[PDB]
Design a protein around this nucleic acid. Structure first.
Lengths: 77, 96, 91, 104, 96, 92, 108, 87, 99
DNA sequence: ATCGAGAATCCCGGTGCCGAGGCCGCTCAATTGGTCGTAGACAGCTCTAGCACCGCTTAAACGCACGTACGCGCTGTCCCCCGCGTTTTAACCGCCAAGGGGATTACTCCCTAGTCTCCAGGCACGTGTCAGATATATACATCCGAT
DNA sequence: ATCGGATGTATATATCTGACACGTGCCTGGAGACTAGGGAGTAATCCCCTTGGCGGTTAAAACGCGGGGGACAGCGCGTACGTGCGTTTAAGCGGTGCTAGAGCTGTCTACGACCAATTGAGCGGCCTCGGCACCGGGATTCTCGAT
């Protein structure tokens, strides 16, 4: 399933990141890193959801998760 | 027939995607991934649509900044080409 | 019902740039900024209170929290503004 | 009357006071604390909106949009220092290429 | 200062600052750059180009548009002096 | 004048894990530093949880949740198990 | 009245559940504090203490020292993934660092 | 009323071999000489930020003397929590 | 007979082992204290110190510098350099968010 | 290539000390054990937002070809770094003297919390337009050979 | 190097639509006008711990002199990654429809706070002794320049 993160999407991300030239080995590594980054956030988010006795995750769960994980996102508070 | 040189369109692409703010990953499969990840922390979960969007913004932002570090690692290594070791170095220096 | 800073932010916008509007997403980000900074200041003010056994957060805590949090010229200007506002409120 | 009107401020001093009390930060909150805090928040608001308004004018747009905020925040060193670990929805990044990557 | 106003200032002739540095100076100064003399206010260059007299500057001379040495940019990026007098201070157009 | 510390409880725990083993005062100061920090982390997140859920009360639920956020997995699970066991015992 | 008995003793814990409750009230964290909280908290802290001191005592034993010192704590902390992750932004006075050299730097 | 001699340029008292010993604990095998002044600058800035906030806690306390707790608070808010001097 | 000499960098490896084994502080005590006092005297006059406060600063500063040099080491190694250069520090601090 | 100086390191053993471990008074902080009000657990209802599934379009991702320019293994040579010996020099240690200010206690009162009564700032939610998205044709900017 | 092919980009004009800029109804949370209990401000007093300085020792830093190996400029050459065309595919969209569960309202009572009597627990001070440090000498390791 994770392979749905497309090669040209990763390229566009690298381009917003100012990268000129790209080893193919990047794509799988990036998918691995992304998966870990997602997992850590999601675990805490689900933890807020579960603490709240919800079955539904909120954007606030993501906010609190990201804030405690040191990456405070404005635009969803 | 006409051609650009290698890298010229890549510099054009940097200008494009740095001038723009649009999210870069396909919405649907990003959500698909999030759901299967979440299934391992708890079964039968559901999401606010906004939470998906917020996650995508966060993930793409995290990746972009990390790629700038990666770019700088390659540049410090006299490469213009990024390699997995650049990411590993950056993540290690970030203390991940 | 649901609170926000938004109308006050809107009046600030009208003050600095009468002819200029704002998007809903941007106004959301403004609320995010306000919330964040309020919490930062208040948390440090609480810590100052604990560190000195004080029951009361006062102007002096806020002034100090600002001096810890803000970079130089923002801190100076914010201090001036808070001092002024306190002076006017007192009179 | 209003507490904000005596302060000469747009921010809601009463709401600030009530927030401070129920935010559990202390047993007590002296009368000038919300006034000072409101002024700080309002000042920072003004400083942001000023620069974002300038950015929007440069972009030839009458309305402030997330791009303009991010742009302003990363163009000012003190804002960027204050907000380094923050991320902004629909902000993107500063247009930026390292000189080594250019032609010749 | 912002002594210029969208002035589409043309740039030519082996400038020792890069075009994006010169553009940044012009546009900090309230200007805009151009590649087109037909819609330019003014042009800036190394004196060597008014010695070479390439078609590009010759079009500017035939537009009678005043032209100045590159240290004009340094001077406007450093001083509030009347551009009319700075033309003289940096003059490469005897024309205009 | 009167101060307080965790030090004796640390020392009892020390006797329990390693009966024959001592500790330096500076190392005990570090242990106190550790207890303080981890206490404060938990209590802050408990407060946030309670706040986000409008609860006047911090409870066992908050501590359990706070731990499940703060600690790495197996360390957290052992901690969750311990705290749960202590609560059921205490309740009896 | 009945003979005085500690909440800590009922919990089967060394850590001071009573002092913990006091600190929770005075620490302004919430308007109210349910009695299971100080128990659960104490147990957690006491467990983490034991988990540290086990490995620190091992580090000391390995060093042939019978008394724990700051070096042992730091060593034990960096030598566990979970403690090191828990304490990664933490510095330890007189801890030093892991003895560690990158292979490229060694003789041929 | 009996003050010590006034302080200037003490950043140079951070010695080359001390900087080397620090780099050696940091596992550095080989050192370019340009490192010394750059390190001094980084250290000077690093110190200044902590010290200012420590002094800020000292001022809030109305104290004239900086405590280890003042240092601890400064470091903790600056994200570099030090165990060894708390209480 | 030619006098003994270790090969270049051999003693540096021995030095790495040495200072990685010890916990001891590495900066000259009183000079460090003088620097701290000098810096502090730029913020407010006549500032006084607990002895402990000074020691804690030296601990903090040395630890910060050491970890920073470890990152610096990696930066040179990644650059295939055996030798550290100011750019290594700068890069690391930039990645760290100090810049 | 493997083999001797010889330099550094780590290992037993007598001293001795001083920090850690320990024990006793004993103050206040925990527990004991009673209220009581309201937090919050639990039931109920509803409507909304999330989930599912469907057909169509076309933007995107993909898959293949190719060449150039990038990465990168190899070489020379230059010096800037490491190592080692002499010098000096200032850090370090003891012990001494002064006195600033941290710490504590006691008093007194200013003021922040709390309460009730009042009401307009601020919130919800209709609605009109002009901001700006979307072409679209157009006139610039700029890249790339081929000269 | 210039010079023109190209194609990509930014700039006028229309337009249209829908988001935000603004108005009205209205209610609750701020706020005006009380009260008082205690937080904290201010004074006074103690003494301790910080600050300064002097003399002596010797560890460390500084300083100078080789020299070798690491830094890095050049470079030959192999591929892997950028650009571009043609293929295919699945993302997207606007639709529909469903019902789970999130959210609001409402009851009732479990239990955390508040006070108050009691006492033993943990802290502060004063012992006393053994784990550790400390040479100091002795055994082992590891390095380098021979071979």
């Amino acid at each position: 399933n994770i392979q749905g993160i497309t090669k040209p999407a990763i390229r566009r991300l690298a381009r917003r990141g100012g990268v000129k030239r790209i080893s193919g080995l990047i794509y799988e590594e990036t998918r691995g890193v992304l998966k870990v980054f997602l997992e850590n956030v999601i675990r805490d988010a689900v933890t807020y959801t579960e603490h709240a006795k919800r079955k539904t995750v909120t954007a606030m769960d993501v906010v609190y998760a990201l804030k405690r994980q040191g990456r405070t996102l404005y635009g969803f508070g | 027939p006409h051609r650009y040189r290698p890298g010229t369109v890549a510099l054009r692409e940097i200008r494009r995607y740095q001038k723009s703010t649009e999210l870069l990953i396909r919405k649907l499969p990003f959500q698909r991934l999030v759901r299967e990840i979440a299934q391992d922390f708890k079964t039968d979960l559901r999401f606010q649509s906004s939470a998906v969007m917020a996650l995508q913004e966060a993930c793409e932002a995290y990746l972009v900044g990390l790629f700038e570090d990666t770019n700088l690692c390659a540049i410090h290594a006299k490469r213009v080409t990024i390699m997995p070791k650049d990411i590993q170095l950056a993540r290690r220096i970030r203390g991940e | 019902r649901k609170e926000s800073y938004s109308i006050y932010v809107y009046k600030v916008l009208k003050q600095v740039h009468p002819d200029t509007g704002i998007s809903s997403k941007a106004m959301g980000i403004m609320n995010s900024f306000v919330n964040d900074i309020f919490e930062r200041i208040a948390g440090e003010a609480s810590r100052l209170a604990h560190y000195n056994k004080r029951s009361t957060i006062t102007s002096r805590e806020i002034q100090t929290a600002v001096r810890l949090l803000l970079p130089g010229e923002l801190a100076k200007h914010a201090v001036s503004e808070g001092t002024k506002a306190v002076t006017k409120y007192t009179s | 009357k209003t507490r904000s009107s005596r302060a000469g401020l747009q921010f809601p001093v009463g709401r600030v006071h009530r927030l401070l009390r129920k935010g559990n930060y202390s047993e007590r909150v002296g009368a000038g604390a919300p006034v000072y805090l409101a002024a700080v928040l309002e000042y920072l608001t003004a400083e942001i909106l000023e620069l974002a308004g300038n950015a929007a004018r440069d972009n030839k747009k009458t309305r402030i949009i997330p791009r303009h905020l991010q742009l302003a925040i990363r163009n000012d060193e003190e804002l960027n220092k204050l907000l380094g670990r923050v991320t902004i929805a629909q902000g993107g990044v500063l247009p930026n290429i390292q000189a080594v990557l250019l032609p010749k | 200062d912002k002594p210029l106003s969208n002035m589409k200032i043309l740039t030519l002739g082996k400038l020792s600052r890069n075009k994006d540095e010169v553009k940044a100076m012009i546009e900090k100064l309230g200007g805009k750059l151009t590649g087109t003399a037909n819609k330019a206010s003014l042009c800036i260059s190394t004196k060597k180009e008014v010695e070479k007299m390439n078609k590009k500057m010759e079009e500017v001379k035939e537009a009678n548009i005043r032209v100045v040495s590159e240290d004009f940019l340094q001077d406007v990026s450093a001083s509030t002096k009347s551009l009319q007098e700075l033309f003289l201070a940096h003059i490469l157009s005897p024309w205009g």
